[PDB]
Amino acid sequence: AWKEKIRKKLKNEIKKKWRKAVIAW
Secondary structure: OOOHHHOOOOOOOOOOOOOOOOOOO
């Protein structure tokens, strides 16, 4: 990799999906 995925795309939603969606929180 090299494009760093532009920091994911809302890392699934900003992480795991926003920290799972603020679910991984």
